[PDB]
């Protein structure tokens, strides 16, 4: 419906420029008739989710690359895709004019955008905050009579979440994660630094902390918001580290095991919020499978844990098979979920690289890797940042798919936005990953899924410089003759009878 307005900032590709009177958008979503496929294409050279259509053919000849769909080889069901409504994201979005705010939220949450259905909500402050606070800073309030939501929630985050829900046609799921407890519950009496809950699981400190989760859910429920899931702590490994610079709360895996078994599990299960899912870990993948082993081999903890949340710092290398793969092999009934991902966090790299195709490819390659290792969903970090990658009270700046420039009442949609959208827009909740078998060695990254209504979706990423002809075979339906251009990403969709 409206094309990308491209702008270059001297990186490898372009951003798309939106403002108070213009943003790129799609027509309302429709499928091609049976016998036709849809292709959405983005390229380093500047194409941004451009739609074209082609015939599904009865016949195929040639010794070229064939990707054969395995519709009956079924893997995980997909929860969805989204990002985080941090204080920084909320401040950046609301710093735009009301029209530009609307176009930004439509970009992420509407069917005229990329159809996000997950929002992660910090429980009080984190690094992507300008004020340090918890919901219960009054000391020694063990019954949490003075628990309350400040304006960061009631004036910024909650109204924006309500606006996102109004724009979405897909049901949206909220995920909550805490960084720190009130400091009077902590061994070090500070929001940051090395420190854990005082005492031991099953005591007043741990029971008060578990009750804070219920107070949080109660408070959001008064604002007519309900949660799909909570995590047991954002990055529990970080609070074990001397000098940790921002909000944290340290748990060893044994500590998290016992806290879930004795306090958090029982407290959530006894509340009106018993249907909220509990995700463990919420941390980097090299903690697996060890953390999963420690927690899930205790039946009293295991009975409360619905899933394992993992963080992806895309700037850094770590094994996928030995972490995610091995965890799925040992614990196939406990879903894996990616709860946070980001790029640009290395001090020596520019936090925000406007128009970086490389960072876009990092996003889509990560998502493909996650989906091929059984992960049910993928959640970006901050929904929007400023050109510095902030605000952030400890200057821990990073990149974001949307960058706001308040001085021009403008926002920029990064390659990362389109790379995420190649998945989020075209993979409804309840889709199932299926197999896809390559006929020969090749340089492409790809994943196939089946929609709840039986339709097919295939994403093909080409991180190489070479255009690669290929054929996609759907054994029931026929052949898609296509090309994967160098430095491109494509999403293919078709009906199946
Ligand atoms: C928002 O951005 C749009 C798109 O760049 C601006 O509209 C363009 O304005 C230039 C200069 O007049 C024209 O050459 C283009 O034809 C316009 N494009 C479109 C699609 O209208 C627009 O002026 C900006 N809005 C604000 C409020 O700054
Ligand atoms: C389990 O859930 C119920 C909520 O229905 C809790 O009962 C409340 O307990 C507090 C204790 O101060 C009372 O003031 C409330 O009046 C009770 N609510 C109702 C509706 O009667 C119960 O304490 C919970 N048990 C826990 C958390 O261990
Ligand atoms: C095995 N494939 C990737 C291979 N063709 C490839 C691509 C680029 C250079 C060298 C080899 S794959 O199945 O598409 C895949 C598996 C995976 F575990 C994570 C991926 F990102 C993608
Ligand atoms: C497809 O292959 C069959 C078998 O040789 C042939 O009869 C048919 O005409 C071919 N062409 C088309 C367009 O289906
Ligand atoms: K308070
Ligand atoms: K940086």
From Swiss-Prot:
Effect of residue 418 to C: In GD and GD1
InterPro entries listed in its UniProt record: GH30_C, Glyco_hydro_30, Glyco_hydro_30_TIM-barrel, Glycoside_hydrolase_SF
Phenotype when changing residue 324 to P: In GD1; uncertain significance; also found in a patient with Parkinson disease; uncertain significance
Result after altering residue 463 to P: In GD; loss of glucosylceramidase activity; increases susceptibility to proteolytic degradation
Outcome when changing residue 157 to Q: In GD1; decreased protein abundance; decreased glucosylceramide catabolic process
Consequence when changing residue 323 to I: In GD1; decreased glucosylceramidase activity; 4-6% of normal activity
Result of altering residue 120 to W: In GD1 and GD2
MF-aspect GO terms: galactosylceramidase activity; glucosylceramidase activity; glucosyltransferase activity; scavenger receptor binding; signaling receptor binding; steryl-beta-glucosidase activity
Active site: 235 (proton donor), 340 (nucleophile)
Keywords: Cholesterol metabolism, Disease variant, Disulfide bond, Gaucher disease, Glycoprotein, Glycosidase, Glycosyltransferase, Hydrolase, Ichthyosis, Lipid metabolism, Lysosome, Membrane, Neurodegeneration, Parkinson disease, Parkinsonism, Pharmaceutical, Signal, Sphingolipid metabolism, Steroid metabolism, Sterol metabolism, Transferase
Outcome of swapping residue 182 to L: In GD1; very low glucosylceramidase activity
Listed GO biological process terms: antigen processing and presentation; autophagosome organization; autophagy; beta-glucoside catabolic process; brain morphogenesis; cell maturation; cellular response to starvation; cellular response to tumor necrosis factor
Membrane topology: Peripheral membrane protein
Effect of residue 318 to D: In GD1; uncertain significance
Effect of residue 462 to D: Loss of glucosylceramidase activity
Substitution effect: residue 399 to N: In GD1 and GD2; decreased glucosylceramidase activity; 14% of normal activity; increases susceptibility to proteolytic degradation
Annotated phenotype, changing residue 409 to V: In GD3; loss of glucosylceramidase activity; results in glycosphingolipid accumulation in brain and liver of a knockin mouse model due to impaired glucosylceramidase activity
Main location group: membrane
A single GO cellular-component term on record: lysosomal membrane
EC number(s) given by UniProt: 3.2.1.45, 2.4.1.-, 3.2.1.-, 3.2.1.46
Subunit record text: Interacts with saposin-C. Interacts with SCARB2. Interacts with TCP1. May interacts with SNCA; this interaction may inhibit the glucosylceramidase activity. Interacts with GRN; this interaction prevents aggregation of GBA1-SCARB2 complex via interaction with HSPA1A upon stress.
Family: Belongs to the glycosyl hydrolase 30 family.
PANTHER family assigned: GLUCOSYLCERAMIDASE, LYSOSOMAL ACID GLUCOSYLCERAMIDASE
Disease involvement: Gaucher disease: An autosomal recessive lysosomal storage disease due to deficient activity of lysosomal beta-glucocerebrosidase, and characterized by accumulation of glucosylceramide in the reticulo-endothelial system. GD is a multisystem disease historically divided into three main subtypes on the basis of the presence of neurologic involvement, age at onset and progression rate: type 1 is the non-neuropathic form, type 2 is the acute neuropathic form with early onset and rapid neurologic deterioration, type 3 is the chronic neuropathic form with slow progression of neurologic features.
Name recorded for this polypeptide: Lysosomal acid glucosylceramidase
């Amino acid at each position: 419906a409206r094309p990308c307005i491209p702008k270059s900032f001297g990186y490898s590709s372009v951003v798309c420029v939106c403002n108070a009177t213009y943003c790129d958008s799609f027509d309302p979503p429709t499928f091609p008739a049976l016998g036709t496929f849809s292709r959405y294409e983005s390229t380093r050279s500047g194409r941004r989710m451009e739609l074209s259509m082609g015939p599904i053919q009865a016949n195929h000849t040639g010794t070229g690359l064939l990707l054969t769909l395995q519709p009956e080889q079924k893997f995980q069901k997909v929860k969805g895709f989204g990002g985080a409504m941090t204080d920084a994201a909320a401040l950046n979005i609301l710093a735009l004019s009301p029209p530009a705010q609307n176009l930004l939220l439509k970009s992420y949450f509407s069917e005229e955008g990329i159809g996000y259905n997950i929002i992660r909500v910090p429980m009080a402050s984190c690094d992507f905050s300008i004020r340090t606070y918890t919901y219960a800073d009054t000391p020694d309030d063990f019954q949490l009579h003075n628990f309350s939501l400040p304006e960061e929630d009631t004036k910024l985050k909650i109204p924006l979440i309500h606006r996102a829900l109004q724009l979405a046609q897909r049901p949206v799921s909220l995920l909550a994660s805490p960084w720190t407890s009130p400091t009077w519950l902590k061994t070090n009496g500070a929001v940051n630094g090395k420190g854990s809950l005082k005492g031991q699981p099953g005591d007043i400190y741990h029971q008060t902390w578990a009750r804070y989760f219920v107070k949080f859910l109660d408070a959001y429920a008064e604002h007519k918001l309900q949660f799909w899931a909570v995590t047991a702590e954002n990055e529990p490994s970080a609070g074990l580290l001397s000098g940790y610079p921002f909000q944290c709360l340290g748990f060893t895996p044994e500590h998290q095991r016992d806290f879930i078994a004795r306090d958090l599990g029982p407290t959530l299960a006894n509340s009106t919020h018993h249907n909220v899912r509990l995700l463990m870990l919420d941390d980097q993948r090299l903690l697996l499978p060890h953390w999963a082993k420690v927690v899930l081999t205790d039946p009293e903890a295991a009975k409360y844990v619905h899933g394992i949340a993992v963080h992806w710092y895309l700037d850094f290398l770590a094994p996928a098979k030995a972490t995610l793969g091995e965890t799925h092999r040992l614990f196939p009934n406990t879903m894996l979920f990616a709860s946070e991902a980001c790029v640009g966090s290395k001090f020596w790299e520019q936090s925000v690289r406007l128009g970086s195709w490389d960072r876009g490819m990092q996003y889509s390659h990560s998502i493909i890797t996650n989906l091929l290792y059984h992960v049910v969903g993928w959640t970006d970090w901050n929904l929007a940042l400023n050109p510095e990658g902030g605000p952030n009270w400890v200057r821990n700046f990073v990149d974001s798919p949307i960058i706001v420039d308040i001085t021009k009442d403008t926002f920029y949609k990064q390659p990362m936005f389109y790379h995420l959208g190649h998945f989020s827009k075209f993979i409804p909740e309840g889709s199932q990953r299926v197999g896809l078998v390559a006929s020969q060695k090749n340089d492409l990254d790809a994943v196939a899924l089946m929609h709840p209504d039986g339709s097919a979706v295939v994403v093909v990423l080409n991180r190489s410089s070479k255009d690669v002809p290929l054929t996609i075979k759907d054994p029931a339906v026929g052949f898609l003759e296509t090309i994967s251009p160098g430095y491109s990403i494509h999403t293919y969709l078709w009906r199946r009878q």
